[PDB]
Write a protein that binds this ligand. Structure first.
Ligand SMILES: [Mg+2]
Ligand SMILES: [Mg+2]
Ligand SMILES: [Mg+2]
Ligand SMILES: [Mg+2]
Ligand SMILES: [Mg+2]
Ligand SMILES: [Mg+2]
Ligand SMILES: [Mg+2]
Ligand SMILES: [Mg+2]
Ligand SMILES: [Mg+2]
Ligand SMILES: [Mg+2]
Ligand SMILES: [Mg+2]
Ligand SMILES: [Mg+2]
Ligand SMILES: [Mg+2]
Ligand SMILES: [Mg+2]
Ligand SMILES: [Mg+2]
Ligand SMILES: [Mg+2]
Ligand SMILES: [Mg+2]
Ligand SMILES: [Mg+2]
Ligand SMILES: [Mg+2]
Ligand SMILES: [Mg+2]
Ligand SMILES: [Mg+2]
Ligand SMILES: [Mg+2]
Ligand SMILES: [Mg+2]
Ligand SMILES: [Mg+2]
Ligand SMILES: [Mg+2]
Ligand SMILES: [Mg+2]
Ligand SMILES: [Mg+2]
Ligand SMILES: [Mg+2]
Ligand SMILES: [Mg+2]
Ligand SMILES: [Mg+2]
Ligand SMILES: [Mg+2]
Ligand SMILES: [Mg+2]
Ligand SMILES: [Mg+2]
Ligand SMILES: [Mg+2]
Ligand SMILES: [Mg+2]
Ligand SMILES: [Mg+2]
Ligand SMILES: [Mg+2]
Ligand SMILES: [Mg+2]
Ligand SMILES: [Mg+2]
Ligand SMILES: [Mg+2]
Ligand SMILES: [Mg+2]
Ligand SMILES: [Mg+2]
Ligand SMILES: [Mg+2]
Ligand SMILES: [Mg+2]
Ligand SMILES: [Mg+2]
Ligand SMILES: [Mg+2]
Ligand SMILES: [Mg+2]
Ligand SMILES: [Mg+2]
Ligand SMILES: [Mg+2]
Ligand SMILES: [Mg+2]
Ligand SMILES: [Mg+2]
Ligand SMILES: [Mg+2]
Ligand SMILES: [Mg+2]
Ligand SMILES: [Mg+2]
Ligand SMILES: [Mg+2]
Ligand SMILES: [Mg+2]
Ligand SMILES: [Mg+2]
Ligand SMILES: [Mg+2]
Ligand SMILES: [Mg+2]
Ligand SMILES: [Mg+2]
Ligand SMILES: [Mg+2]
Ligand SMILES: [Mg+2]
Ligand SMILES: [Mg+2]
Ligand SMILES: [Mg+2]
Ligand SMILES: [Mg+2]
Ligand SMILES: [Mg+2]
Ligand SMILES: [Mg+2]
Ligand SMILES: [Mg+2]
Ligand SMILES: [Mg+2]
Ligand SMILES: [Mg+2]
Ligand SMILES: [Mg+2]
Ligand SMILES: [Mg+2]
Ligand SMILES: [Mg+2]
Ligand SMILES: [Mg+2]
Ligand SMILES: [Mg+2]
Ligand SMILES: [Mg+2]
Ligand SMILES: [Mg+2]
Ligand SMILES: [Mg+2]
Ligand SMILES: [Mg+2]
Ligand SMILES: [Mg+2]
Ligand SMILES: [Mg+2]
Ligand SMILES: [Mg+2]
Ligand SMILES: [Mg+2]
Ligand SMILES: [Mg+2]
Ligand SMILES: [Mg+2]
Ligand SMILES: [Mg+2]
Ligand SMILES: [Mg+2]
Ligand SMILES: [Mg+2]
Ligand SMILES: [Mg+2]
Ligand SMILES: [Mg+2]
Ligand SMILES: [Mg+2]
Ligand SMILES: [Mg+2]
Ligand SMILES: [Mg+2]
Ligand SMILES: [Mg+2]
Ligand SMILES: [Mg+2]
Ligand SMILES: [Mg+2]
Ligand SMILES: [Mg+2]
Ligand SMILES: [Mg+2]
Ligand SMILES: [Mg+2]
Ligand SMILES: [Mg+2]
Ligand SMILES: [Mg+2]
Ligand SMILES: [Mg+2]
Ligand SMILES: [Mg+2]
Ligand SMILES: [Mg+2]
Ligand SMILES: [Mg+2]
Ligand SMILES: [Mg+2]
Ligand SMILES: [Mg+2]
Ligand SMILES: [Mg+2]
Ligand SMILES: [Mg+2]
Ligand SMILES: [Mg+2]
Ligand SMILES: [Mg+2]
Ligand SMILES: [Mg+2]
Ligand SMILES: [Mg+2]
Ligand SMILES: [Mg+2]
Ligand SMILES: [Mg+2]
Ligand SMILES: [Mg+2]
Ligand SMILES: [Mg+2]
Ligand SMILES: [Mg+2]
Ligand SMILES: [Mg+2]
Ligand SMILES: [Mg+2]
Ligand SMILES: [Mg+2]
Ligand SMILES: [Mg+2]
Ligand SMILES: [Mg+2]
Ligand SMILES: [Mg+2]
Ligand SMILES: [Mg+2]
Ligand SMILES: [Mg+2]
Ligand SMILES: [Mg+2]
Ligand SMILES: [Mg+2]
Ligand SMILES: [Mg+2]
Ligand SMILES: [Mg+2]
Ligand SMILES: [Mg+2]
Ligand SMILES: [Mg+2]
Ligand SMILES: [Mg+2]
Ligand SMILES: [Mg+2]
Ligand SMILES: [Mg+2]
Ligand SMILES: [Mg+2]
Ligand SMILES: [Mg+2]
Ligand SMILES: [Mg+2]
Ligand SMILES: [Mg+2]
Ligand SMILES: [Mg+2]
Ligand SMILES: [Mg+2]
Ligand SMILES: [Mg+2]
Ligand SMILES: [Mg+2]
Ligand SMILES: [Mg+2]
Ligand SMILES: [Mg+2]
Ligand SMILES: [Mg+2]
Ligand SMILES: [Mg+2]
Ligand SMILES: [Mg+2]
Ligand SMILES: [Mg+2]
Ligand SMILES: [Mg+2]
Ligand SMILES: [Mg+2]
Ligand SMILES: [Mg+2]
Ligand SMILES: [Mg+2]
Ligand SMILES: [Mg+2]
Ligand SMILES: [Mg+2]
Ligand SMILES: [Mg+2]
Ligand SMILES: [Mg+2]
Ligand SMILES: [Mg+2]
Ligand SMILES: [Mg+2]
Ligand SMILES: [Mg+2]
Ligand SMILES: [Mg+2]
Ligand SMILES: [Mg+2]
Ligand SMILES: [Mg+2]
Ligand SMILES: [Mg+2]
Ligand SMILES: [Mg+2]
Ligand SMILES: [Mg+2]
Ligand SMILES: [Mg+2]
Ligand SMILES: [Mg+2]
Ligand SMILES: [Mg+2]
Ligand SMILES: [Mg+2]
Ligand SMILES: [Mg+2]
Ligand SMILES: [Mg+2]
Ligand SMILES: [Mg+2]
Ligand SMILES: [Mg+2]
Ligand SMILES: [Mg+2]
Ligand SMILES: [Mg+2]
Ligand SMILES: [Mg+2]
Ligand SMILES: [Mg+2]
Ligand SMILES: [Mg+2]
Ligand SMILES: [Mg+2]
Ligand SMILES: [Mg+2]
Ligand SMILES: [Mg+2]
Ligand SMILES: [Mg+2]
Ligand SMILES: [Mg+2]
Ligand SMILES: [Mg+2]
Ligand SMILES: [Mg+2]
Lengths: 63, 100, 146, 202
RNA sequence: UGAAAUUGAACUGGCCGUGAAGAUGCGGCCUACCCGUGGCAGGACGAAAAGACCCCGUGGAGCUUUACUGCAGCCUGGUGU
RNA sequence: GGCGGUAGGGGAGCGUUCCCGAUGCCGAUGAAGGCCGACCCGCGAGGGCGGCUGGAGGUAAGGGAAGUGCGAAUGCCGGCA
RNA sequence: GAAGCUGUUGGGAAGCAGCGCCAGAGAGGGUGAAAGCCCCGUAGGCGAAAGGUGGGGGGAUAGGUGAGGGUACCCGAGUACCCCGUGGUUCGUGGAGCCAUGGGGGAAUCUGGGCGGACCACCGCCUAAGGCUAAGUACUCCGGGUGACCGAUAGCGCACCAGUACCGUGAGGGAAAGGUGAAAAGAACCCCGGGAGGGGAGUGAAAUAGAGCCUGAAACCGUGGGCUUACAAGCAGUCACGGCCCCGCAAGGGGUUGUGGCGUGCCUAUUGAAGCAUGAGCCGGCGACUCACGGUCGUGGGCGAGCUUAAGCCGUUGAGGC
RNA sequence: CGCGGGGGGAACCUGGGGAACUGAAACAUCUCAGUACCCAGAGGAGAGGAAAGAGAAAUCGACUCCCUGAGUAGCGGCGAG
């Protein structure tokens, strides 16, 4: 009774004012040793998901 | 307690079925069963004898316990419901207009 | 108008589905007909495959939180001056919450686009932009202090 | 609407009500359902295979027995077992939004007003709580018993009077409610009542 | 005097086909009046037992060790008595 | 002009229990249930009518709420084979 | 503790008809069927010598209540405090404080001492290591009230002489079983029979209400009647025709089955079953997608830059309101 | 010699002890859960209770219970929870 906000999710995802799900980019914290500048740069931004988008949305809600 | 009801042993009118309008005195009242016997209901007990002692014991037609709600008390008229006026000491049932 | 026919206005058919029958949703009942259709299925929401969910993504949500927890500090809510402009007289933190916006968030901040009423407007902070729109029409005082 | 006939020793005067123009039947169906829901007392219970009186033991082994296969008499597939999704006590009530509650009361009163059945009065000449009195009193009032009358007044004595009547339903001013309004073919009320009605909505 | 397991219902034949690849029940053909009693065990993939073998389940349990981790026990420094 | 259909999606309906309707109406000139029909209305689940039983209940129109429909679960209880 | 009597159908009226009556009472139960006015009640009201309870009201006692100046006496010890091992908290060693404490070391008495999340400073808060304290809260063995709760396979395991009979060494398991009729009027007496049990007589409105007796379903057993069968090949039907028997003016219709054509049970599981793959002897009853909270979309409404109240309070006793 | 204890009570209460299945789709930290259960004691309740309090307001003012605060702040093999 009373759903629990999936703390593990909110700790890594943001819900955009329109209704989209934004999350950081993977692949930039380790594998690196000399990846292009182009790589790491584009790994700094954040993005959007699509269908799993709708999966997480449900794990928050009170949020 | 409270098993008690309308009249005791005395004159009463039958507003029942097969003896409506009939009249008689009540010769017994069975509170444990809420019924009274008058002189009205009478059924034939073809029975030989109730208890083995005594050879003959009768086809007696005797009176069948009448349900106490089919009998109304009566005095100088046609039998009224019972009121209760207490005297200056005791208490006794005045009918719808008179004593006793 | 009697107790006959107040009847629910032709749309509320409480008609739940019964799948215990012989023609409708039969036998298997509802959509099933297979297996792992018994007590219940794993999640899905997040969990499943049993591979990596998508919890492959990661928490840039640094400043996730400390032990003693929340750090209390003044919270400013923006009330857009176009909505403020609505009513008149002289607006204050109380009047604003007292009527629709704010709600004891406590810190009042007129800002945003619209058209300033020539009224006085006590607040906790003005947007640069808001400051001017109202500057060229009326009076504008700052917050108490603490 | 507006054409409410008032009654008094000074004769029949007439008032002007602020009652709503139109009646939404569904709203009344919503308000009545709400009223009949809250009085619903939750009280039906049955026992799960857990609350049933039997023991845990496995009735018999489940292997080379030829018999079916089982756990314990509790199992709902036994006669004298537990019941399945059988009822448990529950609160049927809910909070029908206040705007709605009032709309209803207004529309109810109105529906009767528009039917002409509504009749405010003040002239209660038959006082001392005594059915006979109110009986004769209603005779004058045009209430004979051909139609059901929801009587609403502050005076407990007028209540006492009408109360025992099988074509009347007594009720205080605050008691006003759609169900009772709708029940009876005829609304009739005290001015002090009609007033405290407008108090609620006017 | 009088049971039992079994029992979808039966109006329950042979061959050669046939079919989920072993047919009283479909095809064709052949044989055969109706109902029992005593007796035989070829078929009814006959009864019995939700195959013990085998595999599957991120099932269980007993057992082993230089599998992992832990506990008893023991050994040991420091300290209290 | 369309209209085979499993898993499945959608729609419309029938019937059982209970509530408002009900201080009412049906009812010993016969309630519920049971038995029977070659009748009537419904595509249908059903509904109605009639005779026989039965001996006291039953509950429209329009709504409302569910312990609401069984052929199978080596299902459960009983009866009989 | 109010107010009804007559007629009529009936085994029996409480029904139907006539006229009439109470109601602070037309809740409900009963009386031969369906009753405000017959009975028991109900509305309203009355009551305790004795036991219990009882600041609610009233009375008494215990107890309690002031200012300034000076002195520094006192202000809970193996305690605080730090360390080691832990528990509690949202806190899993985490920057880990707070409360508690098993081991070790071990103070102070207001210029004392604890705390405000390591520590330090500043500024605040608070006085540990003695104790007690009503109400608001939890529960239902017990009594009462009420139900869009059950109605004997339901409802508590038990409506009934059930924690029984019976099973188990024992802990413990744990049933089945309710209904004549308004009244017993429960069937005198005769008849066949050892009895049981029948037939007649009799009671009753009714006895296929006759005593584990209301209704009395299905499987299952049986007698009688109609149609049919001993040269026939079978999922038992179905289509056609003919015979025979029964309804009906009729034309039609009902029952049966002779011959002819056609035809591989139901469910399940499955690429695929009549299948020699699963389940089921048959009938009756019990039997499986709910509910609470929270979500999401659709939907019928109310209000709209707003919308809505929770617990609770008043009210009511099927009234709402704040 | 005098007053008291002893034993019992459906559920409820406090204190001393205190699991595993199961969840994590394996499992060990973790969860189930300080629940189940055992023990002692209280009583119509029990516990708690007048601040070495809370915590940011130069604010509050015993305890208990309900609503909310809030699935927030946090905790977490940052998994499941
Ligand atoms: Mg938005
Ligand atoms: Mg938002
Ligand atoms: Mg949006
Ligand atoms: Mg990386
Ligand atoms: Mg960069
Ligand atoms: Mg929120
Ligand atoms: Mg006498
Ligand atoms: Mg004699
Ligand atoms: Mg006389
Ligand atoms: Mg069903
Ligand atoms: Mg369908
Ligand atoms: Mg389908
Ligand atoms: Mg189907
Ligand atoms: Mg299946
Ligand atoms: Mg689940
Ligand atoms: Mg990272
Ligand atoms: Mg945060
Ligand atoms: Mg400007
Ligand atoms: Mg007018
Ligand atoms: Mg409208
Ligand atoms: Mg038991
Ligand atoms: Mg038990
Ligand atoms: Mg149990
Ligand atoms: Mg067990
Ligand atoms: Mg087995
Ligand atoms: Mg068997
Ligand atoms: Mg079982
Ligand atoms: Mg079990
Ligand atoms: Mg049983
Ligand atoms: Mg039982
Ligand atoms: Mg039960
Ligand atoms: Mg008019
Ligand atoms: Mg009229
Ligand atoms: Mg043969
Ligand atoms: Mg052949
Ligand atoms: Mg054969
Ligand atoms: Mg063929
Ligand atoms: Mg052949
Ligand atoms: Mg033989
Ligand atoms: Mg022989
Ligand atoms: Mg053989
Ligand atoms: Mg042999
Ligand atoms: Mg054979
Ligand atoms: Mg063989
Ligand atoms: Mg097997
Ligand atoms: Mg594995
Ligand atoms: Mg394993
Ligand atoms: Mg093992
Ligand atoms: Mg080694
Ligand atoms: Mg070695
Ligand atoms: Mg070790
Ligand atoms: Mg040592
Ligand atoms: Mg040592
Ligand atoms: Mg030593
Ligand atoms: Mg067409
Ligand atoms: Mg179709
Ligand atoms: Mg539908
Ligand atoms: Mg009638
Ligand atoms: Mg007639
Ligand atoms: Mg019925
Ligand atoms: Mg019924
Ligand atoms: Mg009929
Ligand atoms: Mg209806
Ligand atoms: Mg069910
Ligand atoms: Mg089926
Ligand atoms: Mg069965
Ligand atoms: Mg049997
Ligand atoms: Mg059986
Ligand atoms: Mg047998
Ligand atoms: Mg009386
Ligand atoms: Mg009369
Ligand atoms: Mg005459
Ligand atoms: Mg006549
Ligand atoms: Mg007569
Ligand atoms: Mg009469
Ligand atoms: Mg009549
Ligand atoms: Mg009079
Ligand atoms: Mg009562
Ligand atoms: Mg009547
Ligand atoms: Mg009555
Ligand atoms: Mg009284
Ligand atoms: Mg006194
Ligand atoms: Mg006295
Ligand atoms: Mg008191
Ligand atoms: Mg003194
Ligand atoms: Mg003094
Ligand atoms: Mg001094
Ligand atoms: Mg000193
Ligand atoms: Mg000491
Ligand atoms: Mg010391
Ligand atoms: Mg000291
Ligand atoms: Mg010392
Ligand atoms: Mg120490
Ligand atoms: Mg100290
Ligand atoms: Mg410290
Ligand atoms: Mg140490
Ligand atoms: Mg150490
Ligand atoms: Mg420590
Ligand atoms: Mg502990
Ligand atoms: Mg800890
Ligand atoms: Mg926690
Ligand atoms: Mg922890
Ligand atoms: Mg800690
Ligand atoms: Mg400490
Ligand atoms: Mg210590
Ligand atoms: Mg301390
Ligand atoms: Mg503090
Ligand atoms: Mg600090
Ligand atoms: Mg402090
Ligand atoms: Mg102190
Ligand atoms: Mg101290
Ligand atoms: Mg102290
Ligand atoms: Mg103290
Ligand atoms: Mg203390
Ligand atoms: Mg105390
Ligand atoms: Mg309570
Ligand atoms: Mg009770
Ligand atoms: Mg009671
Ligand atoms: Mg009740
Ligand atoms: Mg009821
Ligand atoms: Mg029984
Ligand atoms: Mg029973
Ligand atoms: Mg029965
Ligand atoms: Mg039975
Ligand atoms: Mg009991
Ligand atoms: Mg008992
Ligand atoms: Mg006995
Ligand atoms: Mg007993
Ligand atoms: Mg018993
Ligand atoms: Mg017994
Ligand atoms: Mg016994
Ligand atoms: Mg024995
Ligand atoms: Mg024994
Ligand atoms: Mg049994
Ligand atoms: Mg018995
Ligand atoms: Mg006798
Ligand atoms: Mg005889
Ligand atoms: Mg003789
Ligand atoms: Mg003889
Ligand atoms: Mg003899
Ligand atoms: Mg005999
Ligand atoms: Mg005899
Ligand atoms: Mg005879
Ligand atoms: Mg006779
Ligand atoms: Mg008759
Ligand atoms: Mg009979
Ligand atoms: Mg017998
Ligand atoms: Mg009867
Ligand atoms: Mg025959
Ligand atoms: Mg024959
Ligand atoms: Mg015939
Ligand atoms: Mg014949
Ligand atoms: Mg043949
Ligand atoms: Mg044929
Ligand atoms: Mg004929
Ligand atoms: Mg004719
Ligand atoms: Mg002709
Ligand atoms: Mg015929
Ligand atoms: Mg074919
Ligand atoms: Mg299979
Ligand atoms: Mg297969
Ligand atoms: Mg398939
Ligand atoms: Mg076969
Ligand atoms: Mg096989
Ligand atoms: Mg088979
Ligand atoms: Mg299989
Ligand atoms: Mg099967
Ligand atoms: Mg078999
Ligand atoms: Mg068998
Ligand atoms: Mg059945
Ligand atoms: Mg809307
Ligand atoms: Mg209340
Ligand atoms: Mg003493
Ligand atoms: Mg004691
Ligand atoms: Mg004690
Ligand atoms: Mg504890
Ligand atoms: Mg402990
Ligand atoms: Mg395990
Ligand atoms: Mg495992
Ligand atoms: Mg824990
Ligand atoms: Mg505990
Ligand atoms: Mg002790
Ligand atoms: Mg004790
Ligand atoms: Mg206390
Ligand atoms: Mg204490
Ligand atoms: Mg103190």
């Amino acid at each position: 009774p009373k759903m629990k906000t999936h703390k593990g999710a909110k700790k890594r995802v943001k819900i955009t004012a329109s209704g989209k799900v934004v999350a950081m980019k993977t692949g930039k914290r380790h594998l690196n040793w000399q990846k292009s500048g182009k790589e790491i740069r584009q790994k700094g931004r954040k993005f959007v998901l699509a269908k799993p988008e709708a999966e997480r949305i449900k794990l928050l809600l009170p949020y | 307690r409270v098993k008690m009801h309308v009249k005791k042993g005395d004159t009463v009118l039958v507003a029942s079925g097969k003896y409506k309008g009939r009249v008689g005195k009540v010769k017994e009242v069975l509170p444990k069963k809420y019924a009274v016997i008058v002189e009205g209901v009478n059924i034939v007990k073809k029975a030989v004898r109730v208890s083995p002692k005594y050879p003959q014991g009768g086809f007696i037609e005797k009176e069948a316990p009448l349900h106490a709600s089919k009998v109304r008390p009566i005095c100088p008229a046609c039998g009224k419901p019972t009121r209760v006026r207490k005297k200056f000491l005791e208490n006794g049932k005045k009918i719808r207009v008179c004593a006793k | 108008d009697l107790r006959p026919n107040p009847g629910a206005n032709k749309r509320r058919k409480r008609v739940g589905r019964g799948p215990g029958s012989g023609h409708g949703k039969t036998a298997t009942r509802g959509h099933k007909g297979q297996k792992s259709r018994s007590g219940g299925l794993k999640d899905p929401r997040r969990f499943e495959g049993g591979r990596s969910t998508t919890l492959m993504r990661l928490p840039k949500r640094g400043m996730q939180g400390q032990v003693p927890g929340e750090i209390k500090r003044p919270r400013y809510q923006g009330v857009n001056l176009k909505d403020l402009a609505r009513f008149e007289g002289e607006v204050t933190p109380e009047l604003l919450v007292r009527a629709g916006l704010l709600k004891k968030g406590y810190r009042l901040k007129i800002l945003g686009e619209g058209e300033a009423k020539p009224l006085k407007v006590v607040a906790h902070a003005f947007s640069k932009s808001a400051l001017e729109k109202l500057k060229a029409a009326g009076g504008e005082p700052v917050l108490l202090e603490a | 609407m507006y054409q409410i006939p008032v009654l008094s020793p000074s004769g029949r005067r007439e008032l002007a009500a602020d009652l709503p123009a139109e009646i939404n039947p569904h709203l009344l169906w919503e308000v009545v359902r709400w009223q009949l829901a809250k009085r619903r007392r939750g009280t039906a219970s049955t026992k799960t295979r857990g609350e049933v009186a039997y023991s845990g033991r496995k009735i018999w082994p489940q292997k080379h027995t030829g018999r079916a296969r089982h756990g314990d008499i509790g199992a709902p597939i036994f006669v004298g077992g537990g019941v399945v999704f059988g009822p448990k006590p529950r609160d049927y009530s809910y909070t029908l939004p206040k705007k709605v509650r009032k709309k209803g009361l207004a529309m109810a009163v109105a529906d009767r007003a528009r039917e002409g059945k509504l009749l405010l009065v003040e002239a209660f000449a038959g006082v001392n709580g005594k059915t006979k009195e109110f009986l004769a009193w209603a005779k004058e009032a045009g209430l004979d018993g051909s139609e059901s009358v929801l009587l609403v007044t502050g005076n407990e004595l007028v209540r006492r009077a009408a109360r025992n009547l099988p074509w009347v339903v007594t009720l205080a001013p605050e008691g006003l409610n759609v169900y009772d309004i709708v029940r009876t073919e005829r609304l009739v009320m005290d001015l002090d009542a009609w007033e405290v009605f407008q108090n609620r909505i006017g």
